[PDB]
Design a protein around this ligand. Structure first.
Ligand SMILES: [Mg+2]
Ligand SMILES: [Mg+2]
Ligand SMILES: [Mg+2]
Ligand SMILES: [Mg+2]
Ligand SMILES: [Mg+2]
Ligand SMILES: [Mg+2]
Ligand SMILES: [Mg+2]
Ligand SMILES: [Mg+2]
Ligand SMILES: [Mg+2]
Ligand SMILES: [Mg+2]
Ligand SMILES: [Mg+2]
Ligand SMILES: [Mg+2]
Ligand SMILES: [Mg+2]
Ligand SMILES: [Mg+2]
Ligand SMILES: [Mg+2]
Ligand SMILES: [Mg+2]
Ligand SMILES: [Mg+2]
Ligand SMILES: [Mg+2]
Ligand SMILES: [Mg+2]
Ligand SMILES: [Mg+2]
Ligand SMILES: [Mg+2]
Ligand SMILES: [Mg+2]
Ligand SMILES: [Mg+2]
Ligand SMILES: [Mg+2]
Ligand SMILES: [Mg+2]
Ligand SMILES: [Mg+2]
Ligand SMILES: [Mg+2]
Ligand SMILES: [Mg+2]
Ligand SMILES: [Mg+2]
Ligand SMILES: [Mg+2]
Ligand SMILES: [Mg+2]
Ligand SMILES: [Mg+2]
Ligand SMILES: [Mg+2]
Ligand SMILES: [Mg+2]
Ligand SMILES: [Mg+2]
Ligand SMILES: [Mg+2]
Ligand SMILES: [Mg+2]
Ligand SMILES: [Mg+2]
Lengths: 102, 62, 77, 93, 46
RNA sequence: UAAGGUGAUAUGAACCGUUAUAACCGGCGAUUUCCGAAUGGGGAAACCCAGUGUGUUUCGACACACUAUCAUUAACUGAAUCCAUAGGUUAAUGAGGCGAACCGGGGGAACUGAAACAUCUAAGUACCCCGAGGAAAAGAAAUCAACCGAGAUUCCCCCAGUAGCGGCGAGCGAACGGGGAGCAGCCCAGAGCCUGAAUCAGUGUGUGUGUUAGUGGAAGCGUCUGGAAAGGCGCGCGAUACAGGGUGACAGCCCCGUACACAAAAAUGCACAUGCUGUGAGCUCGAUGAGUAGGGCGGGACACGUGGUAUCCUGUCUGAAUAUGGGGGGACCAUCCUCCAAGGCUAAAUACUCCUGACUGACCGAUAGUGAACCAGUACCGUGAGGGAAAGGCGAAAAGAA
RNA sequence: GGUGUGCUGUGAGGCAUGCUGGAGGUAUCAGAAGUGCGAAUGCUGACAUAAGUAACGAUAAAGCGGGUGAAAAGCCCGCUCGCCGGAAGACCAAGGGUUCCUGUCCAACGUUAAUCGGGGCAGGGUGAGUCGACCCCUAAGGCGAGGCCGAAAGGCGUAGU
RNA sequence: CGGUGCUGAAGCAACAAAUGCCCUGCUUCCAGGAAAAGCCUCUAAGCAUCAGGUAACAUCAAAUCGUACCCCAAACCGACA
C-alpha cells in the first residue's frame, strides 16, 4: 500500500534538490526516505577511540519527506502519481498518466 | 518450523525439548563468559522451546 | 436480634413527642418472649422467640401450620 | 532425583571477580550466579551433571541489588543468589 | 529530647499493615479509597 | 496485510525478511510465577508450615492432584433415651470479592433560616448500612369522578405558587381536570372435560443484518519572490471527493484521507425461520386471600404540624362481615354512585456513564484547562487516615558545532 | 508580540513609522462576555533591601618537614604536641539500607579551600547442621467454627488458632 | 616499600581478686512470688509373627532466610554532617 518503495527511481518535487533524480536507498518508518545523492548534509563526526575511527566532516544523505518525491516515469521523463490495481490476483502499481504498470 | 515438529510423536518432542534446553544452557555460559558474538541465537532457541512446549500441551489434549 | 420468628415483627423507630412537641428519636420494640410450644405431631417441644401477637397467631392457625411456614421461609427452629 | 529440565535452569553464569579467582586457585571452589529460588541440593546436582565434576559442598548467599540513579530517575537492580561450590580435591574445570 | 516517632517495623505493620487494613470493613474502605485515588503505595511495607 | 522489520527513552550490537511461516492488524486457542475474596493451616500482603492421594527411584528424593467456610439438596451414620431427634461424615450445586453514577430498602444529623429560639426550617438532605438490575421501582383499581363519565404504572407540560398547611411566623405546597411521550395485559388460591393444542424458556440449524482486521478511491504544470512554495502571476483539470491532517510559508489536483463502492476463515450481537427439550392452551362448573378490615393507645406517612381530620403504615392491646357481603366518595349520618382489600407476575415511555467509537463547540491554551499537556496521585509532607506540587516550545532537517 | 519615534482626538484612545520578531492578523456593521486592577496583613513566580552586615554549631590545640597536585592551614606520610579513656574505646539489639571496600571524578553537596568525603560514576563485597530467624511451646492480648446477642454494620465468646 | 616470605626462645610460681561463677543454692521476711511444650514415667483403646521399644555399628540428612556497614551516632529519632 506504499506508493514509494525501496530501489525506486524518484525525482524530487520540493526543496533545495528540486528536479534532481535518484534511487531510494531505504524507507524510514516515520514517512521519510533516503535518496542517494540527494539532500546531503555535512556532519561533524567526532573521532572515537573504539575502532580508532578519526573525526572529520562527512557528507551523508539526509532523510526527506516521502511526499516531496515522486516516482519518475522514464517513458515520459516526468514525475507521476501511483495507483493500484489487481492484474491476476496480485495488487500492482501503475502510473496515473498512461496507466502503465510499474 | 512448527510444521516438521507437528509430524513427531510425544516422546520424540521430549527428546527435542531436552536438546534445546541443553543448547540454551550452553549459550548462557558462552554469553556470560563473553565468548558469544552471535547474540541473536539466544532469542532463537528460546522461541523454539516455546514452540515445542506448545505442541506437547496440544497433543496432551489430543 | 429482636425479631419475632412467626410474624417477623422487628424494632421500629419513631419519636418521643413531649408536651412542647420536642421530637427525640426512639424505638418501639416488639413484645418478644421465648416460649416452648408443644408440637403434638412430633411429640416434642419447640422453643420459639415470638411476640405476644405471634402466640395469638399460633393458637389460631395451629402450631404445625406456623412451623410449616417457617420452613418455607427458611428460618430454623 | 531432580528433573534435568529443572537442572538446566538453576545455573545462570559463572561469577568472575578477584575473590572468585583466588577461591578457585586456593580452595578449589567455583563461584556461580544461580537462580533466585535454587536450593543447595539443586545447585549440587546441577554442577555434578552439567559440569561432570564431583561436588563437596555448596554455600549460598543472596546479593541485594543496588539502588542506582539513571539520569534523574532512581532505579534498583535485581537481587540474585551467589553460590560457592566446593569441588573434590582432584577435579578441574 | 525524646521525639514522637520512635520507629518499630513490627508495630508499624501490626497497626497500619495490609492485613491490619483487611481485617475490618473500615480498613477495607481505606484500601478502596487509595486504589480509587491511584496511590502507588496502598499501605506501609518494604 | 506486507517490503520492510526486532515497543519507548535510544543509538549500537547481533540478526530476520523481500511474492510469502519477517514484522504488523484481527478472530479463536495455548501459556498465565507470587500476593490479593485467597479458599490446605498460619501470617508482619507478595511469606512460613503442612496433610492425603497417586505417578516416579539414581533411596539423595522428586512430579502432579486434592484438602476453606457457609447455604441448599441427598446419602450414610448417629447421643443423653426405646423409638426418635440433635449431632457427625461424604457428595452435588451455589454463594463470598471488586466497580463511577443511576435504583429500592434499613437507619439518619447539624450548621443554617426564623434577623434570638424550643414548634417549625434545613431535610428524609449529608452520611452510614443492606440489596439489586441494565435500568430499578411502580403497575392491571376495594382508583377517580359527580349523577355525566373516565379506565394499570411511569415521565414531561399545564392546572398553580392556586386550594390548603403553618409559633397562620419563617416557610411548606397539592389534587381534580387538561395537553403529550408510551401503551399490555395476566396468574394462583380447583376440580373435570378435552388433553397435551397457545406461550415462554432452554438447545440446535438456516437466512438476513450488524460488530470485531480491511480494499479501491478522482484531478497541475509554467513562472516570480524566497533557505524552502502549498504564496504571487499565468494557463489547466477533478468534484456524490473544497471533512480534516501532514508535507521546508497559506495545497481540491504532493502525501494520508474524504465522497462513494466493496470485503470475513473465525468468533459474536440482533433479528427471523426451523428442529429438539421443558413449558402447558381451550371449555364447563366451582372457588373469591382472618388475627385480616375495623377499633383503643403511642408514633409515622400523606402539601395537610391532631386540628372538626378523611386516607395510608404499625409498636402495643383487641377484633368483624365474608357478595343476603365489604371498601371508598376528606369529621359524621342517610341516599346515590363507584369499586372488590387482606396472593402474585408483567415490556415500553424514565434515571445514569467507570467505559468504547464517531462527531461538535461565539470552551481553555501552560498561574488557563483535569491535581496531572512533562514517567502525577509522582516528588514531597504525615504514625496514620490523609494532604499534595513544580515542571511544555532548538531547527524544515541534528545538519547538535570535525 | 516587543521596543522607540512622530502625528492626532475632550477623554478612554487612535494612526503612521524605525528597529526587533519570523507567521499569522483582520476592516466595517452587528453579536456574546472569564472585558479593563495599585491597594483586599490578596494568590503565584521573579527580584530587591538590610549587607558583603550577623554567622560559619561546644575554648580538646595545634606545629613543622616531605609527598601528591593547576592550586595544600584542612588530603597522604613522618616527627612532635594536645584531648577522651565506665569513653569521645570495643560489641550487640532496634532503626537505617550499601553509608562497607577499590578505582576514578570535584559541577552540585560539605556552613571556607579541597587533590579529601558518609558527595558523583564504575566495579567489588555479606559463604553457617551448631549464631539469629524460621521451627516446637505458651503469657498479656488478638482472632474466633459452631454459639449467644444485636435495626444493618456488628458485639462477646466456646472448641480452637 | 603498603607489605610479603622464612624462622622462632621462655611459655613458671606466688599473691591479690571481682558487681562474674557455684547460686534456679543457703538464711530470712511478707507484700507469698507465670504458663505450656521439649524431657521422664504410667497405663486405656489397640496391637501382638508383626508393629513398636532399648542398645551397638554403619550410613544419610540438617532445608530456607539473615550475615556488608553505622549504634552517645555525620548512617537511628530530632527539617541540618
Ligand atoms: Mg561448610
Ligand atoms: Mg546462609
Ligand atoms: Mg500502635
Ligand atoms: Mg486464610
Ligand atoms: Mg493458603
Ligand atoms: Mg436410642
Ligand atoms: Mg436547629
Ligand atoms: Mg423539626
Ligand atoms: Mg448484570
Ligand atoms: Mg420490576
Ligand atoms: Mg487504500
Ligand atoms: Mg487519491
Ligand atoms: Mg509534500
Ligand atoms: Mg363527602
Ligand atoms: Mg356508571
Ligand atoms: Mg496546570
Ligand atoms: Mg508562556
Ligand atoms: Mg496545578
Ligand atoms: Mg512589528
Ligand atoms: Mg499587578
Ligand atoms: Mg483602588
Ligand atoms: Mg529577603
Ligand atoms: Mg549595620
Ligand atoms: Mg560589625
Ligand atoms: Mg563576626
Ligand atoms: Mg566547627
Ligand atoms: Mg604541610
Ligand atoms: Mg550511594
Ligand atoms: Mg569509606
Ligand atoms: Mg565548597
Ligand atoms: Mg561515596
Ligand atoms: Mg460465626
Ligand atoms: Mg472474639
Ligand atoms: Mg557476617
Ligand atoms: Mg559484621
Ligand atoms: Mg558498634
Ligand atoms: Mg562511641
Ligand atoms: Mg548528634
Amino acid at each position: 500500500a506504499a506508493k514509494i518503495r525501496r530501489d525506486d527511481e524518484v525525482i524530487v518535487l520540493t526543496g533545495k534538490d528540486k528536479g534532481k533524480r535518484g534511487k531510494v536507498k531505504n524507507v524510514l518508518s516515520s514517512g521519510k526516505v533516503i535518496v542517494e545523492g540527494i539532500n546531503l548534509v555535512k556532519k561533524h563526526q567526532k573521532p572515537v577511540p573504539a575502532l580508532n575511527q578519526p573525526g572529520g566532516i562527512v557528507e551523508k544523505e539526509a532523510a526527506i519527506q516521502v511526499s516531496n518525491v515522486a516516482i519518475f516515469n522514464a517513458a515520459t521523463g516526468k514525475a507521476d502519481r501511483v495507483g493500484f490495481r489487481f492484474e491476476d490476483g496480485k495488487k500492482v502499481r501503475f502510473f496515473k498518466s498512461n496507466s502503465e504498470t510499474i | 518450523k512448527a510444521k516438521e515438529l507437528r509430524e513427531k510423536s510425544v516422546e520424540e518432542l521430549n527428546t527435542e525439548l531436552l536438546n534445546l534446553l541443553r543448547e540454551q544452557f550452553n549459550l548462557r555460559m558462552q554469553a556470560a563468559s563473553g565468548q558469544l558474538q552471535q547474540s541473536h541465537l539466544l532469542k532463537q532457541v528460546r522461541r523454539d522451546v516455546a514452540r515445542v512446549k506448545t505442541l506437547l500441551n496440544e497433543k496432551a489434549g489430543a | 436480634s429482636r425479631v419475632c420468628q412467626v410474624t417477623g415483627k422487628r424494632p421500629v423507630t419513631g419519636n418521643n413527642r413531649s408536651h412542647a412537641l420536642n421530637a427525640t428519636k426512639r424505638r418501639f420494640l416488639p413484645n418478644l418472649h421465648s416460649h416452648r410450644f408443644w408440637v403434638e405431631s412430633e411429640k416434642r417441644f419447640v422453643t420459639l422467640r415470638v411476640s405476644a401477637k405471634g402466640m395469638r397467631v399460633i393458637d389460631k392457625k395451629g402450631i404445625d401450620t406456623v412451623l410449616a411456614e417457617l420452613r418455607a421461609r427458611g428460618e430454623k427452629y | 532425583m531432580i528433573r534435568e529440565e529443572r537442572l538446566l535452569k538453576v545455573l545462570r553464569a559463572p561469577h568472575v571477580s578477584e575473590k572468585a579467582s583466588t577461591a578457585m586457585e586456593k580452595s578449589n571452589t567455583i563461584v556461580l550466579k544461580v537462580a533466585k529460588d535454587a536450593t543447595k541440593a539443586e545447585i549440587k546436582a546441577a554442577v555434578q551433571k552439567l559440569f561432570e565434576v564431583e561436588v563437596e559442598v555448596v554455600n549460598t548467599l543472596v546479593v541485594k541489588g543496588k539502588v542506582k540513579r539513571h539520569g534523574q530517575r532512581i532505579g534498583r537492580r535485581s537481587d540474585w543468589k551467589k553460590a560457592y561450590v566446593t569441588l573434590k580435591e582432584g577435579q578441574n574445570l | 529530647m525524646k521525639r514522637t516517632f520512635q520507629p518499630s517495623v513490627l508495630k508499624r505493620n501490626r497497626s497500619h499493615g495490609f492485613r491490619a487494613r483487611m481485617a475490618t470493613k473500615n480498613g477495607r474502605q481505606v484500601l478502596a479509597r487509595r486504589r480509587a485515588k491511584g496511590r502507588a503505595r496502598l499501605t506501609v511495607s518494604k
